[PDB]
Amino acid sequence: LKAQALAIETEAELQRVQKVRELELVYARAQLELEVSKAQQLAEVEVKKFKQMTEAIGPSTIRDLAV
Amino acid sequence: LKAQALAIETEAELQRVQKVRELELVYARAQLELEVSKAQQLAEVEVKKFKQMTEAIGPSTIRDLAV
């Protein structure tokens, strides 16, 4: 009888855990997509700003300005 | 009689453990896929940013800028 009850409760718990974990996986995938989008956009804007500034100041000037 | 009861309970526990572990393995595989996807995307974006910046600043300037 204990084996029967254990089987029933185990199947119920496994069903619940499977649903919860699949939902969590979908949410994590969406969060990862959002994170990588934000990271790449910020990287693009900082790279553009750096290039614009180094073009405005000139590589020749920055060659000896730091020293 | 103890051997009979032990066999019954052992088979029940083995069934439950097998189901739980197969579900856990599937979930772990999905999590690994998500992790490697995020890692490769972030690596791609950081590599692209590094290349863009080192192209904007010029390798000749960076040759002696650090010194």
Side-chain angles (χ1 to χ4, degrees):
Chain A
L1 297 175
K2 170 68 183 69
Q4 292 186 3
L6 184 73
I8 290 173
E9 64 181 2
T10 294
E11 94 167 328
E13 187 63 30
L14 259 304
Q15 289 179 357
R16 183 178 183 278
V17 166
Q18 147 155 345
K19 309 175 142 187
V20 166
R21 289 195 296 192
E22 78 194 340
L23 270 283
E24 175 59 39
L25 192 70
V26 175
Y27 190 74
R29 189 174 304 114
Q31 268 184 340
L32 169 65
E33 194 275 333
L34 200 143
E35 170 186 2
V36 298
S37 181
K38 179 185 92 278
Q40 64 195 357
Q41 291 179 3
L42 298 190
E44 196 275 330
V45 307
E46 62 202 85
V47 162
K48 194 257 288 293
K49 176 174 76 64
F50 176 82
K51 178 199 166 45
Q52 282 189 353
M53 274 184 277
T54 198
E55 178 182 1
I57 199 162
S60 69
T61 302
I62 211 67
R63 186 170 298 163
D64 43 348
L65 169 137
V67 179
Chain B
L1 297 175
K2 170 68 183 69
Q4 292 186 3
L6 184 73
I8 290 173
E9 64 181 2
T10 294
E11 94 167 328
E13 187 63 30
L14 259 304
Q15 289 179 357
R16 183 178 183 278
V17 166
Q18 147 155 345
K19 309 175 142 187
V20 166
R21 289 195 296 192
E22 78 194 340
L23 270 283
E24 175 59 39
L25 192 70
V26 175
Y27 190 74
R29 189 174 304 114
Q31 268 184 340
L32 169 65
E33 194 275 333
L34 200 143
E35 170 186 2
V36 298
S37 181
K38 179 185 92 278
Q40 64 195 357
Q41 291 179 3
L42 298 190
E44 196 275 330
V45 307
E46 62 202 85
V47 162
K48 194 257 288 293
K49 176 174 76 64
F50 176 82
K51 178 199 166 45
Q52 282 189 353
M53 274 184 277
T54 198
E55 178 182 1
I57 199 162
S60 69
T61 302
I62 211 67
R63 186 170 298 163
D64 43 348
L65 169 137
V67 179

